[PDB]
Design a protein around this ligand. Sequence first.
Ligand code: BA
Ligand code: BA
Ligand code: CA
Ligand code: CA
Ligand code: CA
Length: 142
Amino acid sequence: LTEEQIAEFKEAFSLFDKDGDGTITTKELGTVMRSLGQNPTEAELQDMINEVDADGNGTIDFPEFLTMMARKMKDTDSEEEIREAFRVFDKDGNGYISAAELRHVMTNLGEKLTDEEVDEMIREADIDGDGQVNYEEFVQMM
Ligand SMILES: [Ba+2]
Ligand SMILES: [Ba+2]
Ligand SMILES: [Ca+2]
Ligand SMILES: [Ca+2]
Ligand SMILES: [Ca+2]
């Protein structure tokens, strides 16, 4: 949405477009991915291309890249904001939000709850039944 921003996304695109022809092919996406220790199959690479390839011509060009890369940024943004929230709630940072941790954090906001009420909250979120709220469950609740 800004000329600086459009240029930033160009540079990102340039790493994928290895031969500089304005398109990213499956192989070029394959070359890049295998530079990052991911070894995806030929059909996995076609799927990733198809997802972004809006006009179905088989490759991704800069406009299509731009569109994808913004959404990825707008999704990775919020996912970090949900992790940091989860971390403020997960007091001992072990990966699971407990009744005591929820009660304790809610209290320091102001919302002083009972053990019954905090159990109900945890139950309302505890999809996997482990008696605690993990990240997956935390994100669905929000
Ligand atoms: Ba086009
Ligand atoms: Ba295309
Ligand atoms: Ca290319
Ligand atoms: Ca915990
Ligand atoms: Ca759980």
